[PDB]
Amino acid sequence: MFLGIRDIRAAAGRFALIASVVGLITLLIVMLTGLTQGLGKQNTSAIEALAPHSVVFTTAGGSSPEFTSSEISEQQAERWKDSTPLGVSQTRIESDQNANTTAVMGLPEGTPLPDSVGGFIEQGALLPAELADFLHVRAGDHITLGGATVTVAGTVKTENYSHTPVVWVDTATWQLVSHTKAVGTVLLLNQEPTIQPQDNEVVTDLKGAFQAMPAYKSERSSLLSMQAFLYIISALVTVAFLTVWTLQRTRDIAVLAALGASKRYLLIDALGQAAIILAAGVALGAGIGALLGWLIAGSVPFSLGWVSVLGPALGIWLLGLIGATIAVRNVTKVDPQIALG
Amino acid sequence: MFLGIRDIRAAAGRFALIASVVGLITLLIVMLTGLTQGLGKQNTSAIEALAPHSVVFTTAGGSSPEFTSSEISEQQAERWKDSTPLGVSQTRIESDQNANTTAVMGLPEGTPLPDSVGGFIEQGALLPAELADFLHVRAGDHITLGGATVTVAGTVKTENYSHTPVVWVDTATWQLVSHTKAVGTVLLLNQEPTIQPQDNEVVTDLKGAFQAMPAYKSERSSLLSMQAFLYIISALVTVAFLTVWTLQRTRDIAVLAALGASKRYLLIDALGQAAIILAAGVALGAGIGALLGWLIAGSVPFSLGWVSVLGPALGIWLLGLIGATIAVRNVTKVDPQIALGAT
Amino acid sequence: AAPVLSITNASVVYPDGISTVTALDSANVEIFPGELVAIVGESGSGKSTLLSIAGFLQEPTSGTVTLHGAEGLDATSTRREHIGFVFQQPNLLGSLTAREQLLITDHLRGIKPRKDRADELLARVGLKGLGGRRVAQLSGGQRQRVNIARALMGNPQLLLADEPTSALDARLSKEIVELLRDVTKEFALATLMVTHDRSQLAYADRFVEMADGKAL
Amino acid sequence: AAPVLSITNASVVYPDGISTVTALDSANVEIFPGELVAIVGESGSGKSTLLSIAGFLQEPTSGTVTLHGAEGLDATSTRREHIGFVFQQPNLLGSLTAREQLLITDHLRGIKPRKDRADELLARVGLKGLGGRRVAQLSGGQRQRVNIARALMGNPQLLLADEPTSALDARLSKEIVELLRDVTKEFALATLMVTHDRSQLAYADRFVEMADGKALQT
């Protein structure tokens, strides 16, 4: 580890180029990670906040369930005991001052809302605080919700469904706004289902309830594959650079081998140098990443935590160490007779 | 160019590793390119088909225009003459056998639709053929669209608005489905805007009109930024790898220098080797790129032409050649005395 | 009263291209503490091959080599604890300073580097105070001198010099041999010195002449 | 009575670390076609600096070096067109075959590499039908033999040999100096040959003794 560290000192140039490459890849991965978690919470935060155990859908032609096409009839709700119907629709909201499209979720009157959302389902519509400010509306003002006049029951926090904030209404109001005889679009089950489901019904886990949302699976899947290529590219870049680079050092390694340096010593030296270089690159990438992400998290959906910056950071660095050992394997094969030449 | 090409034949191992990195980066770039263009038409294909010259919006509080918040009152429509009302909404469609959510666009009755879409605006709804197949609805069957029962007037081609297909209806029917007294959400203008607008009005060109679509700017911009990082990463990877690589050949280059090889000879040799390596990597990556995309374009939005695969491919190769010259700059700075003794 | 090195009936056979070639042929050499033994002969007579055998840089294809006091140790562990090398090229590690080129041997041996020892040994080679110079600030002779000092850092009992006067003029090469013999005497080292400048035998206590891989 | 090479009062001073170093001091050497001029002297006497000077590898810090028939050329154009280098180490390029070691010189001179000449020369050096061999399959004497052949590809006028028998036993080193002498005479080459093996002077038409960068001459 002695020679390895001072090689880095005396040739900071060569390593700056390669560490920058590792830093960019980590920067992209850290920011791509933040963006995929942000988009995922943009699609699921409301359902996930409600935290159901299973979710009962309705299908047509025995196809996979879709939140865009499922409805639960009143009888269907009485069938599943100890469970409430959740209606999910997206429609236009119009105030005297402004308008926009938003998601509307409807639950039976009095059902307590998740602490993420707080409050409890009241008669009328509970608007997200940011949405009420946009519309210059205050609690108690009339608003046009899906072509029907509804009273603003109060303000709430924002959860999301299909890139839209959720307006929470009582099951009766949701029926008027979505123009349906159904009591909801799905059935939320918090306990494990003890009844076996019907031909048109289908039970799903919380995760599977997300894949029934139209945009979610098809866009998270594409983002995850991109992340996989990025992690793979990082490993290959390190291996490619480090194989060529360790070959550059054969002469100095041969001199140490001739002097008596053990194989363990040479392998530790080489891997130590790579570990420092990869650490530098990954730290700078994730540093710049969290900063740029925090700087952008207002214009683009971006989830920024410790696990979402350091998880990928540590993953990339460990891939680099595995890659590095692959590239450094040949430091123990250097014949010491290369030093007598 | 003699030594450079034969280094590749006799040591194909090391070059395969780096060529794979170049190929993977191009593979990622090729599909990201196709995917970003595919989503843009997924957001804009319908309005592009209508091909208006200018487009008049309605705002509140002087904010940026939004397709989710604009309505044109019927008097407002007579002010601007030579204008056509466009109604844009997304709502639920329900058939006797199935249902789904889709976008509905409404235009004045009888207006011929663009040859992109063809047909004419009829009283009722003109459905995309694929949605009717999904819904098991035929010509003449009644469907529930946003809580209103309307008869399927006919099938058309598919255009898209905000990741949804566009159902084309007359202006009157769209008001029933969208529950509004307005005659539309925007106005399509094929001519020069010669009327002066009010403080609350805003005219925009077709490009800027897409900003008024909620998903388009914020998602195309993010994809474009990712592609830019990818191009920079490619350039840096090649520069990083090729600098250390040319430093490996110093001995062989010194020997050719000692024999009398000109600087152009060594530099042409070196870039030839790099250019061949980069060409192989990009071709292999982009080949697999076009294949996976064409294979995937049925399940995920992916626009695939020649320019959207070879444009980016050629761009990467030129970045790599510029990068390589920066790395091979020291091939002409090697003294031949290195060959006289030992290294 | 006890030898340091004994090479009994040793031979080396390298695969010279498609065929084989006998480099060393039945070499017999024994050095005692405080001896300077030269090995003379033309280039390619087997001098270097015998040196590399004496440093455990390769086992003989037949015959045995015994370094007493390092019995029961692999070849690499033998070089690290008992043998100092004065390579034909100074072999100074680029990124290290004059003093650091002694210290790294302490580190590869697993002991806290001894700065004072390095300065004393550099001074013992007439580079006193030059511990901080980098390789670019060292003349031809000076690097060879730093090379010798490094060989002395682990305090070996076998000192192997491989034509260490090959790139130095008449004056400088005298100094390196005088230094080599003087150190050989002061620290009771057993030293092999390969050389082609027969003018340097006068400073060796004895010498071997070699031809076609056979010692005489 | 007309030299190929004229080194007249040539001196070289490299920066030896902090100080400088007069590696060659006013050397005067001349080589005529058909001569094998040996340069003897110990390692560190200035043979190799005189060689490098002779090979237009580096200009002298003072004094002039002339190759006739090639006047008015930069340093590198002179080597590519009128000199052949038998380097101390064979300096074979790893990815090329035996014949390709010669053909690559023909390519760097701008002429479509002539395989016939590359084989004819390989035979003259006694490597007939080995042009297909790769370096890994060539022994010490053979690599050196390819080196000589590569030096002859360009039909040079000055053939410089830097101790080409340094890693060869007595039997093989005779063959190589015989080959050098024989090729020198047979192609009317002007050959400078640095050598430490005093047994090879017999093959040289003249010899220069050297000590500390100064050529000894009566």
Ligand code: MNR
């Ligand atoms: C099949 C479906 C989809 C796929 C695949 C897909 C692929 C990708 C993708 C892939 C690499 C990236 C990155 C991506 C990124 C985005 N995406 Mn996307 N996306 N995406 C949607 C469906 C899909 N996306 C929908 C639906 C919206 C919002 C609609 C609206 O509000 O108008 C949206 C919007 C967005 C937004 C805007 C968020 C905001 O403004 O708050 C970003 C950013």
